[PDB]
């Protein structure tokens, strides 16, 4: 607003001192608003008389008014100016110059102590900090507890003294400034006596400190504290007595009195607060629910260590919606062994944390497996699988769900092939386009290069290593690269040469990404290979790396790894980058010890530091000389630790490999081990090694309690101890700890008093790893099953034997997107757990420390896993992996294990094509549609080729042009082809099969080449149904009504024709109705749904319905019932559209007894959902004004049809409180129809009260349902309220003669056809499937067969075209025949646009804002569409459907150049959508609809493929009125050209 203040000057108010924030701030007050704008500086200025300038940071409050300067020194002459400007609001302006002199305050006194004060013991205790300001003096009176009440007074502390007062001290800090003083009592004695003491003064008055002799540490675990007490003084070692405390709380938990080590042991969990240690006097205390002691810098890191550990595993981690997630698990105890089997709780648990799935998970030869499908609209996020083993600590396995968008565009990058010096410049050539056949013009390209080393420089000879691992500047970032590219689809990139000195084979590496305009790009990078010379030597160790753990990255990496003390070989060669090694003489091979020794560092900016000096030292040289085709054999002896063996060429080129000879690749105690790893039956000599000498304990500890322990004098020269190793110490989380404690209580030399020391137990066994080798072909060709060997081994010993192996396959960029690591049972049941207890302690506080170290360095995916096979006697192991197409990189992996023993394995496959074929096409095709699809085909040979390509059209499609002339393709060459095609009339799908021919290959032969490609086509029009029936007395005739013919194609006209002897019930047709989406919303599911629960395969095919194996449907449930669970709120109810939508308590109840219903018959549902339903209708029963029913006429109504519903749900359940359902039943008369009180009056029947539930009913049956189509949001009409009623009747057997009567009236009331509501659907379902009709005889003749039909029971029969054209009946039975004829087809013409209540038009506009013609759009044009709906009521439920030309393509964009455009958006935001969806061929919009009130909607389109495209009218209609419907006027046809 802000034009009040028009008129208005500017005067000033008031500037003064105010105190604000809790400090003084100068305050100046306008009379009118000012500008919120940066100008306040050289306009209003504050200056010091004596100091000058000082803070300017003019601060403005939201109140425009108010200018503000925060924060002015005291007993300061501030002069204030204001010259004339500031602005004001209506540009008024200031007047003239103002000036005022200001004298800025004195503080306020303040005195009180630092701190309340800590438990911390001392000798005399010295030194009671506290913050003064403007006081000279203060007064402290000083309080000693009672031994008595102690326990309490320091109890209501944290969470009753004598007095023994001295007091005034004199503190004298300077004016105006807060200084923290010290008070001493070091002169004074009423106080050197130990207790414990609080001070207190005349704002933190109080505070607390203790002096006393016992110095106590405590170790406490998760459910087991032990205690330590030893001296503050005389070095250590103390009796004394101690007890545990509870917090806030007073009492005693636990009492202990220490033995002759001081060791004490107490069992305590949690809310265990204060610990307590009292001698004689001397008491010192110590409170468990501080920070425990911080231990990051210890190699303390690791998993928790469980009894039982379970290890959960999978192929992969990264998925998407639609697609199924694999898990894998096993179990074993604390040292990786066999359990007794047992079942586990497997949870799946969406981002927002509601669970999916519940599964009892039984193992399967001691694997557990899992199998989630993904719901095609499973929300994307961190997912998690939630095991319990029973001990109820959680287990979790994370899995990601991400969906990948497609990117529009086409990048390509080459290079040279063969390898450059490093004289030469690097050329990379682009070459970019659009998808749909356009050459990408005018795009921008923003890449960057980077230079790497490369290692693996020859595909013919694998494994061989090239170039100096140990030369420097051979991996830095090169240049950027923006290239504008303007042209038609090509480009280059040039790279200068920076490298000249480099020895070792380079690469350099250009990634680039391709873009719109400014958005979704499309990346890419291509590599150059770069020698030094033309030939160069090759190093390939004979020794198979071996598998280890890295806590760098926390994963079991392979590393090349020989045996301390033993001979290394190798294979050297002298080759270059095409063909076979070369001949040489004189290769100088060095055997390179690398030589590191460690040195701690502190600075402070990161503390201490662990640093290394390293050198290189030769302990080895050889020299060798090579013929032609020969592979050199070296054998080096080595010892241990790092080397490398080097081999240089007279070409001065080296090339280097890394390896090791051993597995094991200051404020503190130093701890140390004779050995690495141990065995049960060994002893440990522990080295203890203290900065200063003193008194402690040293322990052997894990998790629940210690297991060995000993206190211990360390003196200034070390100390070394000898532990034994019983074994009942087989956990893997055991860790040796060390405290140590300084004599003196007070200390020259700084020095910390307590000093700790921490150490992980190494127990693990070398000989429990399977040695997994997986042999595999590195090429291979796509469709072809891909071949795996495995073999295993295991150092010592014999092969275990029963060995299981599971190995999988998977696409290398899936696992490179999340970094997957393999995984390793190995490392998941030996690895390091982590110190599983607390330290808790009364010497000085660890400080910091700062922390531990870290490391530094589609559409349609390839991810299999086989079944778990065994390997034979000597371990071996054959698994097949069919390769579907892909064209990339696969990573092989391999999870081994048995009763003992565990391994993993990993291989890498690249999958190549010699030729690839990409076909682009539209996202779906209508019938009619003409299409322009794109062939491109491109040869990744090396040699030219000419292919014979061949190409089919399957399904509703068919080809336009004749078949492609025979194409030569040079190397690395696309050629493009063009293959118009048109859809034929039908739902379903089409698809164009391709077929290459020729390609001639040496080495090789190879079937021809096949592809497939799939599309979704559709009628354009709706489908249009025709419904019509009679009741034919013996001897009456019926012939076809011309209607179900009339103006609608054959070949696309079904009928089913119904038969019966008596009242008959279209149930083929609800069944048929009730299952065609959209996947929508959770009615239209649900009532989807309920059909497939009840109604088996061979009760379909009765009624002339096929399609369904009964597992399927099993699965269709199971999916749908997911697909009901992902709308579910966070409070157990549900949602229209999605999971933050607005709530529906009516559908919570549909959606729950469904959800019952569906358990009922056998199906999962996790417990959590109908629990926290059930809550909600208890809720929804006990308190009423939690509901919120949005566009309802009648609350009342609406309320009372919830609580119902609700009632009968929780009623079947028996969780109805009958109290509650007669306190609804007393508000009968707000129900405005009859449904409701028969579901309440079942509720009652069934909870007890039958009486008022029969009245209930009665009054059910003499309620009709009346009222102007408002809403209620109980989603009904008077047929379907009249269905469920006789449904709920006919479920419970009550009233017959009513049911009777009104089940024919309903079967006549039932023709209010032509549009039905799915709820309809539903209940008319409900009622004809739980009605048992009983005998009925009826014969007829009929123009189908010449024999005359028959049957006592109702009769359908689906009839084609030509049988329904010409349909003639005749009863010929003794009595009356009820007859119904049910027609559906597609239109021959265009139908006429249609309205009724609703009204719906579409305009089509570009982007300028002016109208567009469909029939001069170009590709890749942009347009706008425009729909208006409108009604003269209040439509709650309405949807509208846009249905697309396959010519055009949605941008998903909820929208809320400029124009009056904006002037649509604004208007479109105004309107109130519930939900909005853009599919492939759809634009679907879910709104409400108000009187006298246009709702717009508009959106984004794009056309892409060139064609002439089919063109639908707009619909909406009232999703549960579905009489009000409109279709509005098309122009028929789209015309996209290129």
Same mark, same amino acid.
């Given at each position: 607003?802000?034009?009040?203040?028009?008129?208005?000057?500017?005067?000033?108010?008031?500037?003064?001192?105010?105190?604000?924030?809790?400090?003084?701030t100068?305050?100046?007050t306008?009379?009118?608003?000012?500008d919120?704008?940066?100008?306040?500086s050289?306009?209003?200025?504050?200056?010091?008389?004596?100091?000058g300038?000082?803070?300017?940071?003019?601060?403005?409050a939201?109140?425009?008014?108010?200018?503000?300067?925060?924060?002015?020194?005291?007993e300061?002459?501030?002069?204030?100016?204001?010259?004339?400007?500031?602005?004001?609001?209506?540009?008024?302006?200031?007047?003239?110059?103002?000036?005022?002199?200001?004298?800025?305050?004195?503080?306020?006194?303040?005195?009180?102590?630092?701190?309340?004060?800590?438990?911390?013991?001392?000798?005399?205790?010295?030194?009671?900090?506290?913050?003064?300001?403007?006081?000279?003096?203060?007064?402290?009176?000083?309080?000693?507890?009672?031994?008595?009440?102690?326990?309490?007074?320091?109890?209501?502390?944290?969470?009753?003294?004598?007095?023994?007062?001295?007091?005034?001290?004199?503190?004298?800090?300077?004016?105006?400034?807060?200084?923290?003083?010290?008070?001493?009592?070091?002169?004074?004695?009423p106080?050197?006596?130990?207790?414990?003491?609080?001070?207190?003064?005349?704002?933190?008055?109080?505070?607390?400190?203790?002096?006393?002799?016992?110095?106590?540490?405590?170790?406490?675990?998760?459910?087991?504290?032990?205690?330590?007490?030893?001296?503050?003084?005389?070095?250590?070692?103390?009796?004394?007595?101690?007890?545990?405390?509870?917090?806030?709380?007073?009492?005693?938990?636990?009492?202990?009195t220490?033995?002759?080590?001081?060791?004490?042991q107490?069992?305590?969990?949690?809310?265990?607060?204060?610990?307590?240690?009292?001698?004689?006097?001397?008491?010192?205390?110590?409170?468990?629910?501080?920070?425990?002691?911080?231990?990051?810098?210890?190699?303390?890191?690791?998993?928790?260590?469980?009894?039982?550990?379970?290890?959960?595993?999978?192929?992969?981690?990264?998925?998407?919606?639609?697609?199924?997630?694999?898990?894998?698990?096993?179990?074993r105890?604390?040292?990786?062994?066999?359990?007794p089997?047992?079942?586990v709780?497997?949870?799946?648990?969406?981002?927002?944390?509601?669970?999916?799935?519940?599964?009892?998970?039984?193992?399967?030869?001691?694997?557990?497996?899992?199998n989630?499908?993904?719901?095609?609209?499973?929300?994307?996020?961190?997912?998690?699988?939630?095991?319990?083993?029973?001990?109820?600590?959680?287990?979790?396995?994370?899995?990601?769900?991400?969906?990948?968008?497609?990117?529009?565009?086409?990048?390509?990058?080459?290079?040279?092939?063969?390898?450059?010096?490093?004289?030469?410049?690097?050329?990379?050539?682009?070459?970019?386009?659009?998808?749909?056949?356009?050459?990408?013009?005018?795009?921008?390209?923003?890449?960057?290069?980077?230079?790497?080393?490369?290692?693996?420089?020859?595909?013919?000879?694998?494994?061989?290593?090239?170039?100096?691992?140990?030369?420097?500047?051979?991996?830095?970032?090169?240049?950027?690269?923006?290239?504008?590219?303007?042209?038609?689809?090509?480009?280059?990139?040039?790279?200068?040469?920076?490298?000249?000195?480099?020895?070792?084979?380079?690469?350099?590496?250009?990634?680039?990404?391709?873009?719109?305009?400014?958005?979704?790009?499309?990346?890419?990078?291509?590599?150059?290979?770069?020698?030094?010379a033309?030939?160069?030597?090759?190093?390939?160790?004979?020794?198979?790396?071996?598998?280890?753990?890295?806590?760098?990255?926390?994963?079991?990496?392979?590393?090349?790894?020989?045996?301390?003390?033993?001979?290394?070989?190798?294979?050297?060669?002298?080759?270059?980058?095409?063909?076979?090694?070369?001949?040489?003489?004189?290769?100088?091979?060095?055997?390179?010890?690398?030589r590191?020794?460690?040195?701690?560092?502190?600075?402070?900016?990161?503390?201490?530091?662990?640093?290394?000096?390293?050198?290189?030292?030769?302990?080895?040289?050889q020299?060798?000389?090579?013929?032609?085709?020969?592979?050199?054999?070296?054998?080096?002896?080595?010892?241990?630790?790092?080397?490398?063996?080097?081999?240089?060429?007279?070409?001065?080129?080296?090339?280097?490999?890394?390896?090791?000879?051993g597995?094991?690749?200051?404020?503190?105690?130093?701890?140390?081990?004779?050995?690495?790893?141990?065995?049960?039956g060994?002893?440990?000599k522990?080295?203890?090694?203290?900065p200063?000498?003193?008194?402690?304990?040293?322990?052997?500890?894990?998790?629940?309690?210690?297991?060995?322990?000993?206190?211990?004098?360390?003196?200034?020269?070390?100390?070394?101890?000898?532990?034994p190793?019983?074994?009942?110490?087989?956990?893997?989380?055991?860790?040796?700890?060390?405290?140590?404690?300084?004599?003196?209580?007070?200390?020259?030399?700084?020095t910390?008093?307590?000093?700790?020391?921490?150490?992980?137990?190494?127990?693990?066994?070398?000989?429990?790893?399977?040695?997994?080798?997986?042999?595999?072909?590195?090429?291979?060709?796509?469709?072809?099953?891909?071949?795996?060997?495995?073999?295993?081994?295991?150092?010592?010993?014999?092969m275990?034997?029963?060995?299981?192996?599971?190995?999988?396959?998977?696409?290398?960029?899936?696992?490179?997107?999340?970094?997957?690591?393999?995984?390793?049972?190995?490392?998941?049941?030996?690895?390091?757990?982590?110190?599983?207890?607390?330290?808790?302690?009364?010497?000085?506080?660890?400080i910091?420390?700062?922390?531990?170290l870290?490391?530094?360095?589609?559409?349609?995916?390839?991810?299999?896993?086989?079944?778990?096979?065994?390997?034979?006697?000597?371990?071996?192991?054959?698994?097949?992996?069919?390769?579907?197409?892909?064209?990339?990189?696969?990573?092989?992996?391999?999870?081994?294990?048995?009763?003992?023993?565990?391994?993993?394995?990993?291989?890498?496959?690249?999958?190549?094509?010699?030729?690839?074929?990409?076909?682009?096409?539209?996202?779906?095709?209508?019938?009619?549609?003409?299409?322009?699809?794109?062939?491109?085909?491109?040869?990744?040979?090396d040699?030219?080729?000419?292919?014979?390509?061949?190409?089919?059209?399957?399904?509703?499609?068919?080809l336009?042009?004749?078949?492609?002339?025979?194409?030569?393709?040079?190397?690395?060459?696309?050629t493009?082809?063009?293959?118009?095609?048109r859809?034929l009339?039908?739902?379903?799908? +089409?698809?164009?099969?391709? /077929?290459? #021919? *020729? =390609?001639?290959?040496?080495?090789? !032969?190879?079937? &021809? %080449?096949?592809?497939?490609?799939?599309?979704?086509?559709?009628?354009?029009?709706?489908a249009?149904?025709?419904?019509?029936?009679?009741?034919?007395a013996?001897?009456?005739?019926?012939?076809?009504?011309?209607?179900?013919?009339?103006?609608?194609?054959?070949?696309?006209?079904?009928?089913?024709?119904?038969?019966?002897?008596k009242?008959?019930?279209?149930?083929?047709?609800?069944?048929?109705?009730?299952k065609?989406?959209?996947? +929508?919303?959770?009615?239209? /599911?649900? #009532? *989807? =749904?309920?059909?497939?629960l009840y !109604?088996?395969? &061979? %009760?379909?095919?009765?009624?002339?319905?096929?399609?369904?194996?009964?597992?399927k449907?099993?699965?269709?449930?199971?999916?749908?019932?997911?697909?009901?669970?992902?709308?579910?709120?966070?409070?157990?109810?549900?949602?229209?559209?999605?999971?933050?939508?607005?709530?529906?308590?009516?559908?919570?109840?549909?959606?729950?007894?469904f959800?019952?219903?569906?358990?009922?018959?056998?199906?999962?549902?996790?417990?959590e959902?109908?629990?926290?339903?059930?809550?909600?209708?208890?809720?929804?029963?006990?308190?009423?004004?939690?509901?919120?029913?949005?566009?309802?006429?009648?609350?009342?109504?609406?309320?009372?049809?919830?609580?119902?519903?609700?009632?009968?749900?929780?009623?079947?359940?028996?969780?109805?409180?009958?109290?509650?359902?007669?306190?609804?039943?007393?508000?009968?008369?707000q129900?405005?129809?009859?449904?409701?009180?028969?579901?309440?009056?079942?509720?009652?029947?069934?909870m007890?009260?039958?009486?008022?539930?029969?009245?209930?009913?009665?009054?059910?049956?003499?309620?009709?349902?009346?009222?102007?189509?408002?809403?209620?949001?109980?989603?009904g009409?008077?047929?379907?309220?009249?269905?469920?009623?006789?449904?709920?009747?006919?479920?419970?057997?009550?009233?017959?003669?009513?049911?009777?009567?009104?089940?024919?009236?309903?079967?006549?009331?039932?023709?209010?056809?032509?549009?039905?509501?799915?709820?309809?659907?539903?209940?008319?379902?409900?009622?004809?499937?739980?009605?048992?009709?009983?005998?009925?005889?009826?014969?007829?003749?009929t123009?189908?067969?010449?024999?005359?039909?028959?049957?006592?029971?109702a009769?359908?029969?689906n009839?084609?075209?030509?049988?329904?054209?010409?349909?003639?009946?005749?009863?010929?039975?003794?009595?009356?025949?009820?007859?119904?004829?049910?027609?559906?087809?597609?239109?021959?013409?265009?139908?006429e646009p249609?309205?009724?209540?609703?009204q719906?038009?579409?305009?089509?506009?570009?982007?300028?804002?002016?109208?567009?013609?469909?029939?001069?759009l170009?590709?890749?044009?942009?347009?706008?569409?425009?729909?208006?709906?409108?009604?003269?009521?209040?439509?709650?439920?309405?949807?509208?459907?846009?249905?697309?030309?396959?010519?055009?393509?949605?941008?998903?964009?909820?929208?809320?150049?400029?124009?009056?455009?904006?002037?649509?958006?604004?208007?479109m935001?105004?309107?109130?959508?519930?939900?909005?969806?853009?599919?492939?061929?759809?634009?679907?919009?879910?709104?409400?609809?108000?009187?006298?009130?246009?709702?717009?909607?508009?959106?984004?389109?794009?056309?892409?493929?060139?064609?002439?495209?089919?063109?639908?009218?707009?619909?909406?209609?009232?999703?549960?009125?579905?009489?009000?419907?409109?279709?509005?006027?098309?122009?028929?046809?789209l015309?996209?050209?290129?």
């Amino acid at each position: 607003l802000a034009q009040q203040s028009q008129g208005k000057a500017l005067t000033l108010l008031d500037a003064s001192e105010a105190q604000l924030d809790g400090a003084a701030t100068l305050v100046l007050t306008f009379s009118i608003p000012l500008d919120p704008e940066q100008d306040f500086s050289r306009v209003v200025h504050v200056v010091d008389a004596a100091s000058g300038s000082v803070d300017g940071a003019w601060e403005l409050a939201p109140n425009l008014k108010e200018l503000r300067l925060r924060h002015l020194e005291p007993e300061r002459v501030l002069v204030v100016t204001v010259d004339p400007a500031v602005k004001a609001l209506n540009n008024a302006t200031f007047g003239k110059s103002y000036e005022k002199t200001i004298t800025t305050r004195d503080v306020q006194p303040s005195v009180g102590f630092a701190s309340r004060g800590s438990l911390l013991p001392g000798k005399i205790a010295e030194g009671l900090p506290v913050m003064a300001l403007n006081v000279n003096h203060v007064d402290v009176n000083f309080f000693r507890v009672k031994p008595g009440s102690l326990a309490s007074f320091v109890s209501q502390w944290e969470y009753m003294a004598d007095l023994v007062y001295t007091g005034r001290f004199d503190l004298n800090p300077a004016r105006n400034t807060r200084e923290k003083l010290l008070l001493p009592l070091s002169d004074i004695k009423p106080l050197q006596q130990a207790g414990v003491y609080v001070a207190v003064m005349n704002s933190n008055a109080a505070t607390l400190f203790t002096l006393s002799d016992i110095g106590v540490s405590a170790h406490r675990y998760h459910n087991r504290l032990d205690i330590f007490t030893q001296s503050l003084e005389n070095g250590a070692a103390q009796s004394g007595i101690e007890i545990v405390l509870l917090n806030d709380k007073g009492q005693t938990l636990a009492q202990a009195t220490s033995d002759a080590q001081g060791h004490v042991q107490l069992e305590a969990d949690k809310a265990a607060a204060l610990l307590l240690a009292r001698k004689e006097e001397q008491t010192t205390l110590l409170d468990l629910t501080l920070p425990a002691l911080d231990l990051s810098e210890f190699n303390v890191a690791g998993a928790p260590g469980y009894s039982k550990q379970f290890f959960m595993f999978g192929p992969r981690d990264l998925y998407r919606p639609g697609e199924t997630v694999i898990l894998n698990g096993l179990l074993r105890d604390s040292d990786g062994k066999t359990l007794p089997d047992q079942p586990v709780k497997l949870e799946v648990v969406k981002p927002d944390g509601q669970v999916m799935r519940t599964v009892v998970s039984q193992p399967e030869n001691g694997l557990y497996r899992l199998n989630y499908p993904l719901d095609i609209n499973a929300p994307t996020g961190l997912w998690h699988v939630r095991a319990n083993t029973g001990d109820n600590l959680l287990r979790s396995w994370d899995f990601h769900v991400e969906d990948f968008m497609p990117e529009r565009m086409a990048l390509n990058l080459t290079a040279q092939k063969t390898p450059l010096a490093p004289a030469d410049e690097v050329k990379f050539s682009v070459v970019g386009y659009y998808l749909y056949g356009a050459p990408a013009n005018g795009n921008t390209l923003q890449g960057q290069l980077f230079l790497r080393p490369l290692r693996d420089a020859v595909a013919a000879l694998p494994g061989f290593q090239f170039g100096n691992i140990a030369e420097e500047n051979l991996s830095r970032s090169l240049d950027e690269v923006q290239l504008t590219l303007d042209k038609g689809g090509r480009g280059e990139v040039s790279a200068a040469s920076q490298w000249q000195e480099a020895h070792s084979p380079l690469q350099v590496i250009l990634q680039a990404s391709l873009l719109e305009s400014g958005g979704r790009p499309v990346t890419r990078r291509v590599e150059q290979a770069i020698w030094p010379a033309d030939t160069l030597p090759g190093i390939r160790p004979q020794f198979a790396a071996k598998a280890v753990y890295d806590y760098r990255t926390d994963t079991t990496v392979n590393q090349p790894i020989v045996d301390e003390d033993s001979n290394a070989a190798f294979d050297i060669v002298y080759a270059n980058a095409q063909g076979e090694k070369k001949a040489v003489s004189g290769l100088q091979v060095r055997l390179i010890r690398e030589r590191r020794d460690y040195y701690w560092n502190w600075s402070e900016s990161e503390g201490w530091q662990s640093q290394f000096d390293q050198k290189d030292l030769v302990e080895g040289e050889q020299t060798l000389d090579l013929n032609a085709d020969e592979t050199g054999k070296v054998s080096f002896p080595v010892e241990w630790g790092a080397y490398r063996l080097e081999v240089k060429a007279p070409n001065e080129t080296v090339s280097s490999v890394r390896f090791w000879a051993g597995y094991s690749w200051p404020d503190r105690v130093t701890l140390k081990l004779d050995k690495a790893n141990y065995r049960p039956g060994d002893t440990m000599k522990l080295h203890i090694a203290a900065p200063v000498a003193g008194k402690g304990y040293a322990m052997v500890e894990s998790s629940d309690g210690p297991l060995w322990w000993q206190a211990i004098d360390v003196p200034a020269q070390g100390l070394e101890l000898t532990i034994p190793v019983d074994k009942t110490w087989n956990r893997h989380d055991l860790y040796l700890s060390t405290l140590v404690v300084r004599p003196g209580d007070k200390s020259r030399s700084a020095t910390p008093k307590r000093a700790v020391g921490l150490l992980h137990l190494p127990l693990g066994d070398d000989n429990r790893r399977l040695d997994l080798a997986l042999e595999s072909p590195a090429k291979m060709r796509p469709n072809q099953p891909l071949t795996v060997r495995v073999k295993a081994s295991v150092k010592h010993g014999e092969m275990p034997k029963q060995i299981n192996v599971l190995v999988s396959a998977v696409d290398s960029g899936v696992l490179n997107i999340t970094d997957y690591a393999t995984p390793d049972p190995w490392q998941a049941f030996f690895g390091q757990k982590r110190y599983g207890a607390d330290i808790y302690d009364i010497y000085g506080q660890v400080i910091e420390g700062q922390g531990r170290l870290a490391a530094l360095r589609h559409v349609n995916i390839i991810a299999q896993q086989a079944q778990p096979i065994t390997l034979n006697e000597q371990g071996e192991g054959v698994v097949t992996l069919p390769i579907g197409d892909f064209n990339g990189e696969l990573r092989v992996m391999a999870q081994a294990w048995t009763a003992d023993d565990f391994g993993r394995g990993e291989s890498k496959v690249v999958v190549a094509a010699p030729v690839i074929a990409e076909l682009n096409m539209p996202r779906f095709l209508a019938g009619g549609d003409v299409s322009r699809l794109v062939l491109d085909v491109t040869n990744l040979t090396d040699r030219p080729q000419t292919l014979n390509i061949a190409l089919a059209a399957s399904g509703l499609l068919e080809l336009l042009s004749q078949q492609p002339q025979p194409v030569n393709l040079a190397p690395g060459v696309r050629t493009t082809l063009f293959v118009p095609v048109r859809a034929l009339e039908g739902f379903g799908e +089409g698809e164009i099969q391709a /077929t290459i #021919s *020729g =390609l001639n290959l040496p080495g090789e !032969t190879l079937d &021809a %080449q096949h592809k497939q490609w799939q599309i979704g086509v559709r009628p354009a029009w709706p489908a249009q149904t025709v419904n019509s029936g009679i009741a034919l007395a013996p001897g009456e005739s019926w012939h076809v009504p011309e209607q179900h013919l009339a103006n609608i194609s054959p070949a696309t006209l079904q009928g089913q024709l119904l038969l019966s002897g008596k009242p008959p019930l279209n149930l083929a047709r609800y069944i048929r109705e009730l299952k065609a989406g959209p996947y +929508g919303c959770l009615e239209q /599911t649900t #009532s *989807g =749904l309920f059909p497939a629960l009840y !109604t088996n395969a &061979a %009760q379909l095919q009765s009624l002339g319905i096929t399609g369904d194996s009964d597992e399927k449907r099993r699965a269709a449930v199971d999916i749908g019932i997911s697909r009901i669970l992902q709308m579910q709120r966070d409070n157990g109810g549900f949602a229209l559209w999605d999971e933050n939508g607005a709530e529906e308590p009516w559908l919570t109840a549909y959606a729950m007894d469904f959800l019952i219903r569906a358990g009922e018959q056998g199906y999962s549902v996790p417990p959590e959902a109908i629990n926290r339903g059930n809550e909600r209708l208890l809720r929804y029963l006990q308190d009423p004004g939690t509901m919120l029913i949005r566009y309802s006429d009648n609350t009342q109504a609406s309320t009372f049809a919830a609580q119902a519903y609700a009632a009968l749900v929780l009623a079947r359940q028996q969780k109805a409180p009958l109290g509650t359902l007669r306190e609804i039943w007393e508000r009968r008369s707000q129900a405005a129809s009859g449904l409701p009180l028969m579901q309440l009056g079942i509720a009652l029947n069934t909870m007890g009260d039958a009486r008022r539930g029969e009245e209930a009913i009665t009054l059910a049956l003499n309620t009709p349902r009346q009222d102007e189509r408002q809403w209620i949001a109980d989603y009904g009409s008077s047929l379907r309220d009249n269905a469920l009623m006789l449904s709920l009747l006919e479920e419970n057997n009550l009233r017959p003669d009513a049911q009777n009567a009104l089940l024919s009236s309903l079967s006549e009331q039932a023709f209010g056809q032509r549009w039905l509501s799915t709820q309809e659907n539903n209940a008319l379902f409900l009622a004809a499937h739980s009605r048992q009709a009983s005998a009925g005889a009826w014969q007829v003749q009929t123009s189908l067969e010449a024999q005359p039909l028959s049957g006592d029971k109702a009769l359908t029969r689906n009839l084609d075209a030509d049988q329904l054209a010409a349909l003639e009946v005749t009863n010929t039975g003794s009595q009356p025949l009820w007859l119904r004829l049910d027609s559906s087809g597609y239109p021959s013409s265009a139908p006429e646009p249609a309205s009724n209540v609703l009204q719906i038009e579409r305009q089509i506009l570009g982007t300028d804002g002016q109208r567009k013609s469909l029939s001069s759009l170009r590709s890749g044009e942009l347009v706008l569409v425009w729909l208006t709906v409108v009604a003269d009521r209040n439509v709650p439920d309405a949807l509208v459907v846009d249905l697309l030309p396959a010519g055009l393509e949605l941008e998903n964009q909820n929208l809320a150049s400029g124009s009056e455009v904006q002037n649509l958006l604004n208007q479109m935001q105004q309107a109130d959508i519930q939900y909005m969806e853009f599919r492939d061929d759809r634009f679907v919009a879910a709104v409400v609809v108000n009187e006298g009130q246009p709702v717009t909607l508009v959106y984004l389109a794009r056309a892409v493929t060139p064609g002439t495209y089919q063109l639908a009218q707009p619909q909406v209609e009232s999703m549960y009125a579905p009489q009000w419907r409109a279709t509005g006027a098309s122009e028929g046809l789209l015309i996209v050209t290129p």
